[PDB]
Amino acid sequence: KLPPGWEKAMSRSSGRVYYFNHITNASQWERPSGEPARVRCSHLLVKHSQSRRPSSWRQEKITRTKEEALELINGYIQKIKSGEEDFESLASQFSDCSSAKARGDLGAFSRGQMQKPFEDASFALRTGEMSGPVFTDSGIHIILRTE
Numbered sequence: 001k002l003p004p005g006w007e008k009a010m011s012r013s014s015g016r017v018y019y020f021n022h023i024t025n026a027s028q029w030e031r032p033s034g035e036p037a038r039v040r041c042s043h044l045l046v047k048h049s050q051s052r053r054p055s056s057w058r059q060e061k062i063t064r065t066k067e068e069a070l071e072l073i074n075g076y077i078q079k080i081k082s083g084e085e086d087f088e089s090l091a092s093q094f095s096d097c098s099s100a101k102a103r104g105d106l107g108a109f110s111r112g113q114m115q116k117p118f119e120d121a122s123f124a125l126r127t128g129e130m131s132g133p134v135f136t137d138s139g140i141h142i143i144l145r146t147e
């Protein structure tokens with residue numbers, strides 16, 4: 001019926017159907033369109049007190065809770081989707097990953113290199129598509145597949 005990992009859902013506020021991908025946590029109103037050796041992605045990471053390494057270039061000791069980290073991620077997704085902000089601009093300013101200095105770009109990679117939830121979301125995204133919140137042991141990610 002639908003591309004890998006998509007399902008129909010219904011908006012609780014409007015009643016209109018939408019589509020949800022349980023691998024990327026993406027959601028969209030329109031019926032989704034539709035694997036390569038390698039993909040290229042950028043990401044924006046928000047770490048929290050239970051991250052594997054609760055430290056980043058932004059903060060020596062990262063103290064925010066997982067719930068507070070998810071709220072930050074949600075707010076960034078909102079501004080990226082509204083066009084108020086660019087993904088690259090928010091990644092440079094707020095990503096708790098050293099790749100912030102590269103607008104979040106992680107380069108190209110194959111299966112077997114990245115943490116599994118990140119890898120699965122990256123390979124399920126279409127070119128140009130962006131994920132919802134993706135959880136790994138490092139924290140919470142917004143992933144943009146660029147190639």
Ligand SMILES: CN(C)c1ccc(CN)cc1
Pocket residue numbers: 045096097098106114115118136138
């Ligand atoms: C792609 N991936 C799982 C990833 C996780 C954490 C960081 C930050 N050190 C960078 C990349």
